[PDB]
Structures are given as structure tokens and as C-alpha cells.
Amino acid sequence: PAALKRARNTEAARRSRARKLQRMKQLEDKVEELLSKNYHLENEVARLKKLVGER
Amino acid sequence: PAALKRARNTEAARRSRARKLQRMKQLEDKVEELLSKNYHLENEVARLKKLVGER
DNA sequence: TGGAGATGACGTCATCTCC
DNA sequence: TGGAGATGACGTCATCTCC
């Protein structure tokens, strides 16, 4: 009966919502990570720049 | 009547969903941007590294 | 104040994409 | 194949957070 097609999907719907919230969270975390790897890489270049050649 | 509290919220609900999809999209785009700024900054350091001092 | 609007999380339906 | 499961987008309800 209808009942069971609905039951089985309410749950496929619940798992699905949970994956989406773990996707959003990873992105939020990675933007943040790449933003800090960048500050250090842009300092590194500044440092080596004021130095290459020998001064 | 109830009717109108529901009407007004169905719409606050529609705007809200649209903001969320523009949030997800910006993150997707920025992870990507910071990943390419990084490849170039890690090449830059490699280049200047094999050079500082003079060789 | 209390009153409005924004948002989580639900359940549903219609559509896709697979073995 | 067709049959199951994953997903968009809806509408709703209960809760928050503000001026």
C-alpha cells in the first residue's frame, strides 16, 4: 500500500538531509583552512622576496 | 485568521530557501578559488626557493 | 512589550539515475 | 526491464531574535 512507499521515502529523506548538513559543514571548514594556508604562503613569498639575490 | 499567518510564512520560507542555495554556491566557488591561488603561491615559493642566495 | 520575520526539521510529492 | 533510492522544492509547525 501507499503507506510503505511513504514510510521508506521519509527515511531516505532524513538520511539525505543529514548528508547535506555534513556537506555544508565541510565547505565552511575548508574555506577557513585554505584561508590560513594562504596567509602563511603570502608571508613566505614576502620573506623570500626581500632576500633573493642576497638582499 | 490562521490563513494569513500561514501565507506570510510560506513566503518567508521561500526567500529563506533561496538565500541558502546562494550560500552553498558561494562556498563551492570560493573553495575552488583559494585552491588555485594556492597552486600559484606554492609554485612561486618553489621558484624563489631554488634561487635565494643566488642559486 | 509584543509583535513580525527568519530558520531548523519534518513529511510529502514528482523526478532522476541506476543494476 | 522495472524497480528502488536519492533529491529538489514545497508547505508547515515551533522556536529564536529583534525594535
Tab-separated table of all heavy atoms in Angstrom, chain C residues 16-19, chain D residues 1-5:
chain	number	residue	atom	x	y	z
C	16	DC	P	12.951	14.447	-15.101
C	16	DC	OP1	13.580	15.668	-15.720
C	16	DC	OP2	11.987	13.636	-15.914
C	16	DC	O5'	14.188	13.468	-14.461
C	16	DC	C5'	15.488	14.022	-14.030
C	16	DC	C4'	16.559	13.135	-13.320
C	16	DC	O4'	16.036	12.740	-12.055
C	16	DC	C3'	16.934	11.863	-14.124
C	16	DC	O3'	18.158	11.847	-14.932
C	16	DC	C2'	17.006	10.804	-13.063
C	16	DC	C1'	16.357	11.359	-11.838
C	16	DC	N1	15.265	10.434	-11.471
C	16	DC	C2	15.486	9.589	-10.366
C	16	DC	O2	16.535	9.589	-9.706
C	16	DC	N3	14.510	8.722	-9.995
C	16	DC	C4	13.375	8.685	-10.675
C	16	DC	N4	12.469	7.815	-10.262
C	16	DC	C5	13.137	9.542	-11.808
C	16	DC	C6	14.116	10.397	-12.161
C	17	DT	P	19.698	12.059	-14.350
C	17	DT	OP1	19.804	13.364	-13.626
C	17	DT	OP2	20.654	11.739	-15.434
C	17	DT	O5'	19.853	10.871	-13.287
C	17	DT	C5'	20.993	10.700	-12.412
C	17	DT	C4'	21.119	9.201	-12.089
C	17	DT	O4'	19.779	8.818	-11.627
C	17	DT	C3'	21.376	8.423	-13.439
C	17	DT	O3'	22.706	8.009	-13.942
C	17	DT	C2'	20.332	7.345	-13.429
C	17	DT	C1'	19.550	7.510	-12.118
C	17	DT	N1	18.125	7.128	-12.231
C	17	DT	C2	17.630	6.376	-11.226
C	17	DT	O2	18.306	6.031	-10.270
C	17	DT	N3	16.319	5.992	-11.299
C	17	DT	C4	15.462	6.292	-12.286
C	17	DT	O4	14.313	5.885	-12.250
C	17	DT	C5	16.044	7.086	-13.318
C	17	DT	C7	15.155	7.471	-14.510
C	17	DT	C6	17.336	7.475	-13.264
C	18	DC	P	24.165	7.733	-13.199
C	18	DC	OP1	24.606	8.925	-12.412
C	18	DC	OP2	25.100	7.151	-14.210
C	18	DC	O5'	23.696	6.584	-12.147
C	18	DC	C5'	23.521	5.265	-12.642
C	18	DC	C4'	23.056	4.265	-11.592
C	18	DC	O4'	21.666	4.480	-11.285
C	18	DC	C3'	23.226	2.826	-12.171
C	18	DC	O3'	23.885	1.889	-11.287
C	18	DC	C2'	21.825	2.383	-12.474
C	18	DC	C1'	20.952	3.260	-11.603
C	18	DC	N1	19.766	3.409	-12.456
C	18	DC	C2	18.641	2.776	-12.044
C	18	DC	O2	18.600	2.127	-11.011
C	18	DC	N3	17.538	2.872	-12.789
C	18	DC	C4	17.526	3.562	-13.900
C	18	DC	N4	16.397	3.606	-14.580
C	18	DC	C5	18.686	4.239	-14.361
C	18	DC	C6	19.785	4.127	-13.599
C	19	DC	P	25.117	0.954	-11.802
C	19	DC	OP1	26.324	1.832	-11.823
C	19	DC	OP2	24.725	0.208	-13.041
C	19	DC	O5'	25.326	-0.096	-10.552
C	19	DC	C5'	24.358	-0.762	-9.717
C	19	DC	C4'	23.535	-1.924	-10.330
C	19	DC	O4'	22.388	-1.498	-11.063
C	19	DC	C3'	24.298	-2.873	-11.254
C	19	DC	O3'	25.007	-3.879	-10.464
C	19	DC	C2'	23.164	-3.363	-12.220
C	19	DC	C1'	21.858	-2.634	-11.790
C	19	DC	N1	21.051	-1.793	-12.729
C	19	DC	C2	19.660	-1.718	-12.543
C	19	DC	O2	19.099	-2.357	-11.647
C	19	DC	N3	18.948	-0.899	-13.407
C	19	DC	C4	19.588	-0.214	-14.380
C	19	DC	N4	18.924	0.582	-15.189
C	19	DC	C5	20.996	-0.294	-14.577
C	19	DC	C6	21.684	-1.090	-13.726
D	1	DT	O5'	15.550	-2.093	-19.893
D	1	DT	C5'	14.566	-2.757	-20.719
D	1	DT	C4'	13.390	-3.528	-20.025
D	1	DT	O4'	13.913	-4.388	-19.005
D	1	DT	C3'	12.301	-2.778	-19.291
D	1	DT	O3'	11.136	-3.626	-19.189
D	1	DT	C2'	12.949	-2.666	-17.928
D	1	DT	C1'	13.466	-4.040	-17.680
D	1	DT	N1	14.676	-4.158	-16.857
D	1	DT	C2	14.601	-4.946	-15.706
D	1	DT	O2	13.579	-5.539	-15.350
D	1	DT	N3	15.777	-5.032	-14.973
D	1	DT	C4	16.975	-4.414	-15.310
D	1	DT	O4	17.944	-4.598	-14.584
D	1	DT	C5	16.949	-3.614	-16.528
D	1	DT	C7	18.165	-2.857	-17.040
D	1	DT	C6	15.830	-3.519	-17.234
D	2	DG	P	9.838	-3.224	-18.275
D	2	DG	OP1	8.779	-4.264	-18.408
D	2	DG	OP2	9.494	-1.819	-18.663
D	2	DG	O5'	10.395	-3.306	-16.701
D	2	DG	C5'	9.705	-4.109	-15.696
D	2	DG	C4'	9.797	-3.698	-14.169
D	2	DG	O4'	11.177	-3.532	-13.773
D	2	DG	C3'	9.060	-2.381	-13.764
D	2	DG	O3'	8.753	-2.167	-12.373
D	2	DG	C2'	10.129	-1.387	-13.996
D	2	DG	C1'	11.413	-2.122	-13.618
D	2	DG	N9	12.510	-1.401	-14.332
D	2	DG	C8	12.441	-0.548	-15.421
D	2	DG	N7	13.588	-0.059	-15.797
D	2	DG	C5	14.469	-0.624	-14.891
D	2	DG	C6	15.852	-0.446	-14.794
D	2	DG	O6	16.524	0.280	-15.517
D	2	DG	N1	16.413	-1.184	-13.763
D	2	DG	C2	15.694	-2.007	-12.921
D	2	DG	N2	16.346	-2.666	-11.945
D	2	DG	N3	14.368	-2.171	-13.011
D	2	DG	C4	13.833	-1.450	-14.011
D	3	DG	P	7.965	-3.291	-11.534
D	3	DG	OP1	7.066	-3.970	-12.483
D	3	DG	OP2	7.330	-2.710	-10.319
D	3	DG	O5'	9.269	-4.260	-11.241
D	3	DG	C5'	10.177	-4.488	-10.117
D	3	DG	C4'	11.101	-3.372	-9.487
D	3	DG	O4'	11.938	-2.611	-10.380
D	3	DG	C3'	10.354	-2.420	-8.553
D	3	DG	O3'	10.489	-2.814	-7.175
D	3	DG	C2'	10.991	-1.094	-8.842
D	3	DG	C1'	12.225	-1.390	-9.648
D	3	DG	N9	12.455	-0.267	-10.578
D	3	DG	C8	11.562	0.429	-11.344
D	3	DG	N7	12.098	1.367	-12.077
D	3	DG	C5	13.443	1.281	-11.763
D	3	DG	C6	14.528	2.037	-12.267
D	3	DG	O6	14.499	2.931	-13.126
D	3	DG	N1	15.719	1.625	-11.646
D	3	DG	C2	15.857	0.631	-10.685
D	3	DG	N2	17.051	0.343	-10.166
D	3	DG	N3	14.827	-0.073	-10.247
D	3	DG	C4	13.661	0.302	-10.828
D	4	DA	P	10.235	-1.831	-5.874
D	4	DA	OP1	10.118	-2.685	-4.665
D	4	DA	OP2	9.140	-0.853	-6.147
D	4	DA	O5'	11.678	-1.060	-5.752
D	4	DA	C5'	12.759	-1.844	-5.194
D	4	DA	C4'	13.979	-1.078	-4.752
D	4	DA	O4'	14.398	-0.335	-5.900
D	4	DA	C3'	13.735	-0.083	-3.618
D	4	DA	O3'	14.943	0.119	-2.906
D	4	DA	C2'	13.502	1.176	-4.389
D	4	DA	C1'	14.465	1.050	-5.555
D	4	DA	N9	14.002	1.813	-6.683
D	4	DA	C8	12.722	1.934	-7.112
D	4	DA	N7	12.594	2.690	-8.163
D	4	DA	C5	13.893	3.095	-8.441
D	4	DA	C6	14.421	3.927	-9.446
D	4	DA	N6	13.612	4.492	-10.335
D	4	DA	N1	15.741	4.144	-9.488
D	4	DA	C2	16.482	3.551	-8.560
D	4	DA	N3	16.113	2.745	-7.548
D	4	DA	C4	14.767	2.554	-7.545
D	5	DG	P	15.032	0.754	-1.417
D	5	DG	OP1	15.777	-0.245	-0.586
D	5	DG	OP2	13.688	1.230	-1.010
D	5	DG	O5'	15.914	2.085	-1.589
D	5	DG	C5'	17.248	1.945	-2.063
D	5	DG	C4'	17.751	3.241	-2.648
D	5	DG	O4'	17.023	3.709	-3.807
D	5	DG	C3'	17.623	4.298	-1.579
D	5	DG	O3'	18.918	4.922	-1.623
D	5	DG	C2'	16.414	5.075	-2.148
D	5	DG	C1'	16.676	5.029	-3.592
D	5	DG	N9	15.561	5.240	-4.408
D	5	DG	C8	14.306	4.788	-4.283
D	5	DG	N7	13.510	5.186	-5.255
D	5	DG	C5	14.321	5.964	-6.065
D	5	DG	C6	14.028	6.680	-7.271
D	5	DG	O6	12.970	6.791	-7.902
D	5	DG	N1	15.144	7.322	-7.753
D	5	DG	C2	16.381	7.286	-7.158
D	5	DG	N2	17.348	7.969	-7.762
D	5	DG	N3	16.659	6.627	-6.032
D	5	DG	C4	15.582	5.991	-5.543
